[PDB]
Paper text:
Evidence indicates that variable lymphocyte receptors (VLRs) play roles equivalent to those of Igs and TCRs in the adaptive immune system of cyclostomes. VLRs consist of an N-terminal cap (LRRNT), the first LRR (LRR1), multiple (usually up to seven) 24-residue variable LRRs (LRRVs), a terminal or end LRRV (LRRVe), a connecting peptide (CP) and a C-terminal cap (LRRCT), followed by an invariant 3′-terminal region. Recently, a third VLR, designated VLRC, was identified in lampreys. VLRC sequences are more closely related to VLRA than to VLRB sequences, leading to the speculation that VLRC+ cells are T-lineage cells and that, like jawed vertebrates equipped with two lineages of T-cells (αβ and γδ T-cells) and one lineage of B-cells, lampreys may have two lineages of T-like cells (analogous to αβ and γδ T-cells) and one lineage of B-like cells.
The crystal structure of the lamprey VLRC ectodomain (residues from His25 to Cys247) was determined by molecular replacement at a resolution of 2.3 Å. The structure has a horseshoe-like solenoid conformation, which is typical of proteins that belong to the LRR protein family. Lamprey VLRC is composed of eight modules, including LRRNT, LRR1, LRRV1, LRRV2, LRRV3, LRRVe, CP and LRRCT in this order. The concave surface of lamprey VLRC is formed by the β-sheet made up of eight β-strands (two from LRRNT, five from LRRs and one from CP); the β1-strand is anti-parallel whereas the remaining β-strands are arranged in a parallel fashion. Like VLRA and VLRB, N-terminal and C-terminal caps of VLRC have a total of four disulfide bonds presumably important for structural integrity: two within the LRRNT (Cys28-Cys39, Cys37-Cys52) and two within the LRRCT (Cys200-Cys227, Cys202-Cys247). We calculated the Shannon entropy for each position based on the multiple alignments of 102 Japanese lamprey VLRC sequences and mapped variable residues onto the VLRC crystal structure. This revealed that variable residues are located predominantly on the concave surface, in particular in the region around the core β-sheet, suggesting that, similar to VLRA and VLRB, VLRC recognizes its ligands through the concave surface. A striking feature of lamprey VLRC is that its N-terminal cap has a long loop protruding toward the concave surface. This protrusion is formed by amino acid residues 41–48 located in the region connecting two β-strands β1 and β2. Indeed, ∼80% of known VLRC sequences from Lethenteron japonicum have the same sequence, NKTDSSPE, and the remaining ∼20% have closely related sequences. Crystallographic analysis of VLRC confirmed this prediction.
Residue numbers in the entry: 25 to 247
Write the structure that this text describes.
């Protein structure tokens, strides 16, 4: 068995042609899948692999899905993402990766996604974020990093996000005892007026708000 028998014919997943209320959809959600099925039609616009039991994504799983605008991989058991897994996905608008077990991301993993508007990485266990990982996402409106293991963010990580409207940073063990936090502290203070949801970023996860931190003491303490 595969994902679809045709564009509008189900197999494992529910497969719909594009309609006036929905894009061309392959719905594999809630199927307890342990593997990404083959047979995902080339013109698929919306791929829902959320709420399954995927532990690995094949590196070439999404190659050729040029029309993909929506990709849901949230609520699985992903420990990592393959290098280049989202390359070629030029038309992607939404990428849902929340509620996995991601500890890290490959550099340049989002680079092809120049039309991405919504990115969720919340409820994982990201220990760090690679430098420049968001630099290509100039059309991003909403980014969710809440509930992870981030102690800091690389200098200038959000600077290319000129169209950002919403950024969630809460429930992260932010390290406000060293100089690396100053960039984050500064970004929140400067952009709380144009980007929402940032003020919940707290030192050590649940302590003093990063935004209100006294930086004079730690400005010279190297992390």
């Amino acid at each position: 068995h595969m994902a679809c028998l045709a564009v509008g014919k189900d197999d494992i997943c529910t497969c719909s042609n594009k309609t006036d209320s929905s894009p061309e959809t392959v719905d594999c959600s809630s199927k307890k899948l342990t593997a990404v099925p083959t047979g995902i039609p080339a013109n698929t616009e919306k791929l829902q692999l959320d709420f399954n039991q995927l532990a690995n994504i094949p590196a070439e799983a999404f190659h050729g899905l040029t029309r993909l605008t929506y990709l849901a991989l949230d609520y699985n058991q992903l420990q990592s993402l393959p290098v280049g897994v989202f390359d070629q996905l030029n038309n992607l608008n939404e990428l849902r990766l929340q509620d996995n077990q991601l500890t890290s991301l490959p550099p340049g993993v989002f680079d092809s996604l120049t039309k991405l508007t919504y990115l969720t990485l919340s409820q994982n266990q990201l220990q760090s974020i690679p430098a420049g990982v968001f630099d290509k996402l100039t059309n991003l409106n909403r980014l969710e990093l809440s509930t992870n293991q981030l102690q800091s963010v690389p200098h200038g990580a959000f600077d290319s996000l000129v169209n950002l409207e919403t950024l969630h940073l809460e429930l992260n063990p932010w390290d406000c005892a060293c100089s690396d936090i100053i960039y984050l502290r500064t970004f929140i203070a400067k952009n709380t007026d144009k980007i929402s949801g940032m003020e919940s970023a707290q030192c050590n996860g649940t302590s003093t708000a990063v935004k209100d931190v006294n930086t004079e003491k730690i400005k010279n303490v190297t992390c």
